[PDB]
Amino acid sequence: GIATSGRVTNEDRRWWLVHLECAPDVTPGTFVSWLDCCGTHTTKKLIERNIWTIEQVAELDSDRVDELKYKEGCLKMDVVWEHARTIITPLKQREVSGGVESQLQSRILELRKKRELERQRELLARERATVSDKREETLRRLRE
Amino acid sequence: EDVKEIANILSSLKVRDLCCVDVSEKTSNFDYMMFGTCEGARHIHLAAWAVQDADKVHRISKIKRQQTDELWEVVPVGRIVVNLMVESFREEMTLERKWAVTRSMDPLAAANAPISEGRQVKAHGLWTLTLNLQD
Amino acid sequence: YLLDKSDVLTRVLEVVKNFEKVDASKVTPESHFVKDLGLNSLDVVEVVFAIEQEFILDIPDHDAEKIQSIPDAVEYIAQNPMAK
Amino acid sequence: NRRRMELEQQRIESSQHLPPIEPTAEQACHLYRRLLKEGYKTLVVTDKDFYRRKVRYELEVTSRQTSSRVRGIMFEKGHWMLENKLGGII
């Protein structure tokens, strides 16, 4: 993690995993700047090496990341590396499949199919309430 | 089930015009408010003290009772709140038509067509009110 | 198929007698709805719940609005094929 | 900047007719049949005879001294009662 120093325990591997709900857009094609403690500077030391996505960040051979943190002067380059090295494989299974119980596919259209039916009842409330009145008006224009 | 037992109790002590309203899911906080039209201040105290005992053996939770001041006495069963008003003091206030008219308290209540409709409000008074904006 | 007319005639000519708005001795076999029985516009359905008290089933809406001053409207009870 | 709401509100003049009709006709008699027939199924707890008296009284107190739309508001509320399956009067 960001506030973590030096080594990365086998725990905050979980903290990285638990927090993948609140990052649904993220994918192995996401820009590396989305990575815990991959700030502004370190990115520019990454882009200078043609490294852009989380996916490439998992390819570094423990020597790019080393010559990065120990020669390019980009700091915390180890706590970011272990991050892409952690979520890439649960994100790689987002390239092939989205949600498994999300979807609930027979459900997700029945939610969508009614939202048209629903948001077309207020617009029609502007109509159904008054045209029903126009008749209840014209029903009495004649009775007199 | 429990709300109907209170009616099989009060209706024995000669309470009149007893009306229950499933006020749940609506704007109020209780879920079933009932109303009773007893005549005497004593006749309001009995029905108050009588429903307490039923709230002692089946629903044992009978924390408290009050001493006096039984012109309009109120007895709650927590969320099934029973009002017991005098014969009068009902041609004044709701007895219905505030909870029998209140809409179902649903979402999307974000400043509808000017909310100053209040058929439950305009039933009793006028109550000027100005809708706001960033205006 | 339907009820015998003279049988309800023994009871419909009573239910409206001892009613709420009118005293039974202030009623006649043909006592007008508004005039002789004092009933009013809204109560045109009130006594209907005395007719629906005689014949059980629920009648379509116009029928309940159709009927005239009630002791003149039991004439439709004979016209009523739903006499239960 | 802000005055968009001015652009909005002046655009929500929206004179789709909707004046509550103020029913001065038999339309009132419709519900007073539909009510006492839709209530007669439900009045388990509350009294069946107290409930008629109040629908009467509400069909004079609202007819006697109210406005036009607020009578087309009340009458519309009569419609929305059994549409809400009742006024929660159980």
Side-chain angles (χ1 to χ4, degrees):
Chain A
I2 307 157
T4 62
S5 301
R7 276 187 188 163
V8 192
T9 176
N10 85 286
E11 202 275 344
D12 40 30
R13 320 263 190 185
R14 281 290 183 200
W15 193 263
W16 284 331
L17 281 180
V18 158
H19 284 179
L20 287 213
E21 310 278 44
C22 315
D25 156 274
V26 191
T27 158
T30 324
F31 196 36
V32 56
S33 50
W34 190 95
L35 262 194
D36 214 56
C37 185
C38 211
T40 44
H41 151 52
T42 159
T43 302
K44 307 180 201 172
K45 278 317 190 174
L46 274 164
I47 292 176
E48 189 184 328
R49 291 149 174 280
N50 211 304
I51 285 161
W52 294 77
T53 83
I54 287 202
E55 183 154 26
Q56 301 172 271
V57 175
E59 300 164 7
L60 324 178
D61 48 357
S62 86
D63 301 349
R64 285 307 188 274
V65 60
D66 173 281
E67 91 184 4
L68 270 179
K69 61 209 266 213
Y70 292 149
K71 191 260 308 165
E72 297 281 347
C74 59
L75 276 74
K76 307 275 281 265
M77 186 45 78
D78 198 0
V79 69
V80 42
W81 177 43
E82 311 284 333
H83 199 190
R85 262 209 56 258
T86 294
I87 71 180
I88 183 171
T89 37
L91 277 182
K92 271 179 178 169
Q93 289 203 315
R94 205 173 295 182
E95 270 171 338
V96 297
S97 56
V100 172
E101 201 162 17
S102 198
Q103 205 161 1
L104 300 191
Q105 175 48 237
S106 41
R107 306 181 108 180
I108 184 165
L109 256 275
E110 290 187 357
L111 318 187
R112 267 208 201 184
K113 276 196 164 198
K114 75 182 168 191
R115 283 321 161 185
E116 304 106 32
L117 169 87
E118 292 265 62
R119 301 312 187 225
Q120 290 341 288
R121 290 210 222 100
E122 167 160 0
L123 160 64
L124 265 292
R126 312 276 302 269
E127 287 114 22
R128 290 157 178 166
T130 172
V131 190
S132 315
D133 269 353
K134 295 192 185 199
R135 291 194 314 152
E136 279 143 27
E137 195 193 34
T138 329
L139 174 46
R140 276 165 298 102
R141 308 188 205 200
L142 333 177
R143 297 196 208 195
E144 294 100 18
Chain B
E1 315 194 14
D2 44 3
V3 45
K4 299 188 286 196
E5 291 209 10
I6 324 292
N8 316 306
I9 290 155
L10 284 145
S11 319
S12 46
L13 329 174
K14 270 186 59 48
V15 65
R16 279 93 65 179
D17 307 328
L18 161 73
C19 190
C20 161
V21 188
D22 176 25
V23 68
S24 145
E25 101 199 339
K26 283 183 180 58
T27 315
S28 158
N29 48 29
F30 312 131
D31 283 20
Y32 311 81
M33 41 199 46
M34 301 159 31
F35 307 84
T37 310
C38 269
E39 55 164 4
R42 280 87 200 285
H43 207 162
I44 303 190
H45 209 43
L46 298 172
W49 193 89
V51 61
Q52 288 260 298
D53 305 9
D55 201 16
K56 166 65 204 173
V57 85
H58 202 54
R59 304 282 161 287
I60 45 197
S61 326
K62 202 250 312 195
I63 308 298
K64 24 199 165 208
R65 75 134 160 189
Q66 262 256 328
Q67 194 209 320
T68 327
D69 205 327
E70 319 144 4
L71 156 73
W72 161 36
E73 189 146 67
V74 160
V75 177
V77 183
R79 295 160 105 181
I80 306 90
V81 175
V82 205
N83 304 256
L84 285 135
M85 329 197 203
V86 64
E87 308 219 348
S88 168
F89 199 52
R90 287 197 97 192
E91 71 157 46
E92 283 64 18
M93 58 197 310
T94 157
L95 68 91
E96 82 167 38
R97 205 181 52 175
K98 293 268 191 72
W99 307 117
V101 176
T102 294
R103 287 291 271 179
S104 171
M105 181 199 174
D106 54 70
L108 296 156
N112 198 320
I115 86 148
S116 94
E117 299 187 14
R119 184 253 165 287
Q120 84 169 55
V121 158
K122 190 43 215 52
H124 180 41
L126 43 94
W127 181 244
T128 187
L129 66 105
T130 162
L131 85 170
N132 247 326
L133 201 91
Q134 339 161 34
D135 76 314
Chain C
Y1 182 25
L2 61 150
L3 190 96
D4 31 26
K5 197 266 176 192
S6 279
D7 218 298
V8 59
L9 182 46
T10 60
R11 208 142 45 107
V12 60
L13 270 193
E14 170 57 72
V15 55
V16 292
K17 305 263 300 152
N18 58 353
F19 208 63
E20 184 250 345
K21 285 191 149 180
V22 73
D23 217 314
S25 309
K26 218 138 64 190
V27 197
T28 60
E30 300 295 291
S31 271
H32 198 89
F33 194 68
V34 204
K35 303 189 302 188
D36 311 349
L37 301 174
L39 284 119
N40 219 311
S41 76
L42 275 169
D43 316 331
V44 87
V45 60
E46 174 199 24
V47 285
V48 161
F49 291 98
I51 316 305
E52 305 328 289
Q53 192 185 204
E54 171 94 52
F55 293 167
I56 162 63
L57 60 94
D58 186 316
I59 211 61
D61 209 71
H62 184 206
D63 297 288
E65 143 77 36
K66 270 205 318 173
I67 86 173
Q68 328 91 23
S69 68
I70 33 167
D72 323 67
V74 55
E75 281 63 11
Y76 150 79
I77 286 315
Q79 254 182 15
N80 204 335
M82 307 314 289
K84 309 299 179 58
Chain D
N1 325 336
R2 270 306 169 194
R3 47 200 308 186
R4 321 297 179 73
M5 299 310 290
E6 297 266 315
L7 312 164
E8 310 322 321
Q9 276 183 135
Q10 83 194 105
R11 201 185 64 210
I12 306 298
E13 82 283 42
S14 178
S15 166
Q16 54 95 354
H17 194 25
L18 197 45
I21 65 148
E22 159 65 51
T24 92
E26 188 253 351
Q27 282 135 328
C29 171
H30 293 147
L31 274 179
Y32 197 33
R33 163 55 132 79
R34 305 183 68 181
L35 282 184
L36 298 187
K37 263 309 177 198
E38 283 265 10
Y40 186 40
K41 315 170 172 174
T42 86
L43 311 150
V44 42
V45 183
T46 184
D47 304 325
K48 67 135 202 176
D49 266 325
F50 151 86
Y51 176 63
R52 307 162 180 274
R53 174 169 72 229
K54 287 307 292 175
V55 173
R56 295 164 170 156
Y57 191 99
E58 77 166 279
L59 274 179
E60 301 126 356
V61 75
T62 299
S63 165
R64 275 320 156 283
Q65 283 283 1
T66 70
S67 102
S68 89
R69 41 185 288 115
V70 65
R71 201 165 315 155
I73 281 289
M74 196 285 259
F75 174 76
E76 171 74 26
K77 184 65 51 47
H79 276 329
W80 278 350
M81 259 195 37
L82 44 88
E83 281 290 336
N84 294 332
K85 90 94 204 184
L86 243 188
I89 315 170
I90 303 186

